[PDB]
């Protein structure tokens, strides 16, 4: 899958995309890669942040299918045209689908002022597809009308300029090291997971299990932060806020509302903790560990136009939806996400940043008790 590997490209915080071909003649788009969603959606009228965009007029094999899509979110927006094309992936494998596509006619808050996409490409499952779960997603379209297996794997790099492999219809071994594991994908909806252990440098907050997940915990390929309920995100800085004394810094920096800034290489990664999540394995009892450096969870902050200086935010935050999982956990590892078997794969990333230190880890198996009990029902 060498064709495949580095055919992913992003700025630090404006997420990862992939060129995508739709319409015949193909018109070539650049197109966010979101485990989150399940809708593809292309800009499709010359909205003045945009590059390129979608024109249905231009191509034989458009089809309108005389239905809109409305698809508010906080303080934005996105809503078009619902119709068929032809769809492909230049750098993907060597086939074309006839897919769903929202042509976005009315955004607010969608697009990023400087950014290099121009459309969303939602790889969740058709439950939470808008309007309703009739409308098939790409991918489910994909596997469906060709010979591609029911998977894909991402690996997220990163360190202005990010970069990264979508690897459609299997896994490339040079992409991560050491071993895959294995977590189950709950429920086909979100790629939904259980958490059934967080240790914040050995030690765990000793919570109930059930308020990881509570109400879902999820990976997330669009969302940059690891985003932890404010019950056990309280838990969990307090316990990275008592770790990361003899350090000194603010408290509206933990609720990412002011950033942190050292001199240009003076950031101390050390006086803050790994932090270990895990995830219930494939057999019963059996768990194991994924563990993320401070270099995950601090991220490089961009166009500090006030300053010229080291500057990152924390990179963890509260939710009402639940866990997520977005880039911060992803760049560690190489991820599977094996539809075909509903359950999802990390290993370490032969990409990720580490040291002559600590480094990103995938360890099992370990013996956890009672993980079904996790679950939030
Ligand atoms: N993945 C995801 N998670 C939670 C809510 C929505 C969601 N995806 C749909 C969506 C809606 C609105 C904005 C975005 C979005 C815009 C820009 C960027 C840059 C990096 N990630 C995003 C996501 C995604």
Redesign the pocket.
Known sequence: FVEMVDNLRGKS???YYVEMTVGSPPQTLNI?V????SNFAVGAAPHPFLHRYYQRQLSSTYRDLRKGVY?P?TQ?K?EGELGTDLVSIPHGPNVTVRANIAAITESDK?F?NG?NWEG?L?LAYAEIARPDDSLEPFFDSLVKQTHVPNLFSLQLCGAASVGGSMIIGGIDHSLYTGSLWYTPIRREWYYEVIIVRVEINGQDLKMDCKEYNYDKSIV?????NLRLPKKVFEAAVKSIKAASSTEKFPDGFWLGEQLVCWQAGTTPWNIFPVISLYLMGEVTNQSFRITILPQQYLRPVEDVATSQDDCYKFAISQSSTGT?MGAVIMEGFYVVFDRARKRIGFAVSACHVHDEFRTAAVEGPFVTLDMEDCGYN
């Open positions: 915080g404006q997420g966010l979101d485990t989150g969603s698809v979110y934005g996105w969608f990023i950014s969303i939602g997330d390929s669009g969302t940059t997520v």
